[PDB]
């Protein structure tokens, strides 16, 4: 019975690993997007941009 | 009178220069530039002030 319980626990831990990995990938994409947005915000602060390029 | 006429021509030339020099549509020596902020460092705050007088 303990062996079967360990099988169940290993399966559940593996499922949790997969969910964690998927969320980690999505968060990685989100942080890359945030870095690009930071670059854009820094670029706009330049005082040579009149109005249109802003 | 001839010298005055040439001086008047040069004066209108000075006005044209003041009103014409533009960095891609952004007038510089007209007087609208005033003061601008140049973001020259990583993160916010690290910037300088450029002041152009007509």
A50 in B contact zone (CB under 8 Å):
yes
- Put simply, the chain A residues between 30 and 49 with a CB less than 8 A from any chain B CB are 42, 45-48
What gap in Å lies between CA B41 and CA B44, rounded to an integer? 7
Provide the resolution (angstroms).
3.4
Which residue has tokens 């969320």? A23
What's the angle, vertex CA B29, arms to CA B26 and CA B31, rounded to 5? 85
DSSP-H helix ranges across chain A = 2-44
Rounded to the nearest angstrom, the gap between the alpha carbon of residue B32 and the centroid of all alpha carbons in its chain is 8
Method: cryo-EM
B50 contacts in chain A (CB < 8 Å):
47
């Amino acid at each position: 019975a303990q062996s079967r319980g360990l099988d169940v626990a290993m399966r559940n831990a593996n499922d949790g690993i997969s969910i964690a990995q998927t969320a980690e990938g999505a968060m990685n994409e989100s942080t890359s997007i945030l870095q690009r947005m930071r670059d854009l915000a820094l670029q706009s602060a330049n005082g040579t941009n009149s109005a249109s390029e802003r | 009178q001839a010298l005055n006429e040439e001086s008047v021509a040069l004066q209108d030339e000075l006005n044209r220069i003041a009103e014409t020099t533009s960095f891609g549509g952004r007038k510089l020596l007209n007087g609208s530039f005033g003061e601008a902020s140049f973001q020259i460092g990583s993160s916010s705050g690290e910037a300088i002030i450029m002041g152009l007088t007509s």
